[PDB]
Amino acid sequence: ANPSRLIVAIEIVEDEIPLTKVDGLKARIILIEDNTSEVGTQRVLPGTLVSDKDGSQSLVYPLFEAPVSFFGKLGDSNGMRVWSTTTADIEEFDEAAMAKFKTRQFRIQLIEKPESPVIVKTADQQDYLNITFDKGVYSDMYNADLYVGDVLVDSYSDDGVVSGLSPLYSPFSQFYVYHENIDLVRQMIYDTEMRVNPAAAAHTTAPGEIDFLTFLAVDGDPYQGIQVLGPLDGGITLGKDGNIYASGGTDG
C-alpha cells in the first residue's frame, strides 16, 4: 500500500559546548518516520533537545526526503550513505567547481541489506554519485550536472536503449531537497563558526560551503562551533560507513 521512505533531518540548539566553554551549537542528525505525508511537506518543528545555557528548545529541520520505488516492507532494505568532500583525502574532487559556485561537494551511495551492507552501483557502474545539494552546479571534472534532485534517480536508472539490456530502475523514485531549510541550517553554522573561529573564513568563505551532515570543514577539520551528538546521545553518524535505511513500508 505504501512505499518505504527516508527523511533526513538535523536537530540543532544554541548551547555552551566545549571548544577542544564557548557559545556555539549542539547538533544531531535524525530520521523522520513518515510515509503518509506528501513528499516535500515536512515542517521545521521543535525537537526534544533543550539548552543547558538558556532554556531554549531545539528545532528539527527536514533536509532531504527519498521515497522507495516499489510497494512493500522489503523497501525497508533500501537505504543510503552520504559524506562531504575534503582537501585532505586520497580521492580528489572538483575544487574549482566548488570555488566557482561557492558550494560543497558530497558523495552519496545507495545500499541494500542484508548487512557490511551491499552497494547498489549506479547505471554507469560507479560505486557512488558525486552531488551538490544546490542547483546550477555543472562540473567539468565529471562533465555532469551535480544537483542531487536532478541527477540521482536518473543516474541509478537505465531505460536500456543504447545499453541494450533490460530497463534498469532506481530503488529511490525521487530525491526531494529542502532548500530553504538547508540554507537556514548552513547560515546558522557559518555564523556561529565565523564568530567562534574567525580564521575558518579562509577556506569557508560562504555559508554554501558548510558541510551540514558530517560537519567537516573543507580543510578536513571539524567545525569548532559544533558539538556533534552520536548514537550515545540520540543521534546518527552519517559518513562513508554511516548507514541509513528507508522505513515504514506497508503491504496491505
Side-chain angles (χ1 to χ4, degrees), residues 49-70:
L49 220 56
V50 306
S51 177
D52 295 314
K53 162 79 169 310
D54 72 347
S56 58
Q57 189 77 43
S58 68
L59 285 183
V60 180
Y61 304 79
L63 297 175
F64 64 96
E65 187 177 1
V68 174
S69 294
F70 47 83

Side-chain angles (χ1 to χ4, degrees), residues 4-247:
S4 304
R5 188 185 302 180
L6 191 50
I7 310 166
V8 170
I10 181 172
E11 202 171 357
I12 316 173
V13 228
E14 282 221 47
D15 219 339
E16 305 291 310
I17 71 185
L19 226 210
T20 150
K21 317 294 192 306
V22 77
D23 176 73
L25 291 174
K26 248 177 176 69
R28 72 176 169 194
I29 303 304
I30 52 182
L31 305 191
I32 299 188
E33 287 169 292
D34 186 348
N35 352 267
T36 307
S37 312
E38 181 187 354
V39 173
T41 81
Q42 294 297 307
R43 296 200 127 249
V44 180
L45 264 273
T48 69
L49 220 56
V50 306
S51 177
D52 295 314
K53 162 79 169 310
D54 72 347
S56 58
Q57 189 77 43
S58 68
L59 285 183
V60 180
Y61 304 79
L63 297 175
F64 64 96
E65 187 177 1
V68 174
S69 294
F70 47 83
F71 278 151
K73 286 177 185 175
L74 107 53
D76 293 8
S77 300
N78 298 116
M80 43 178 71
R81 285 158 185 177
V82 210
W83 63 91
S84 50
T85 49
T86 287
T87 54
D89 212 30
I90 68 232
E91 270 309 68
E92 289 318 337
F93 71 86
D94 194 345
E95 301 199 2
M98 161 165 59
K100 190 162 174 281
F101 304 101
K102 292 204 169 301
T103 189
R104 191 64 166 273
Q105 189 173 304
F106 290 91
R107 265 147 207 175
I108 184 163
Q109 80 171 354
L110 306 202
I111 60 178
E112 266 177 353
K113 297 177 192 192
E115 65 206 26
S116 181
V118 161
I119 291 172
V120 175
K121 279 183 171 62
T122 182
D124 301 337
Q125 287 292 134
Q126 275 189 346
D127 290 346
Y128 65 72
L129 185 51
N130 281 310
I131 56 158
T132 57
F133 289 86
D134 290 299
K135 294 198 168 167
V137 175
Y138 173 77
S139 163
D140 295 323
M141 171 167 177
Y142 311 101
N143 302 101
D145 280 310
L146 264 35
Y147 175 48
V148 209
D150 278 20
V151 176
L152 181 138
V153 179
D154 279 334
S155 289
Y156 282 91
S157 295
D158 166 15
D159 63 12
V161 73
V162 157
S163 176
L165 303 198
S166 37
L168 173 78
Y169 294 89
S170 178
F172 291 96
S173 70
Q174 68 171 121
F175 197 92
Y176 183 93
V177 170
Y178 290 86
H179 286 110
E180 184 178 41
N181 296 350
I182 288 171
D183 280 349
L184 228 35
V185 172
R186 293 141 135 187
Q187 199 54 44
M188 208 170 178
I189 297 161
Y190 181 75
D191 298 349
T192 287
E193 246 237 343
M194 292 318 100
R195 171 212 321 170
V196 158
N197 178 191
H203 306 62
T204 311
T205 57
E209 300 188 355
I210 291 295
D211 159 16
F212 58 94
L213 297 165
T214 53
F215 318 109
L216 306 187
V218 167
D219 293 79
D221 41 331
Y223 302 116
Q224 251 164 336
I226 307 192
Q227 157 185 330
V228 191
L229 293 187
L232 303 155
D233 286 288
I236 285 176
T237 305
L238 284 20
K240 290 160 157 201
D241 267 335
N243 309 334
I244 60 174
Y245 289 95
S247 59

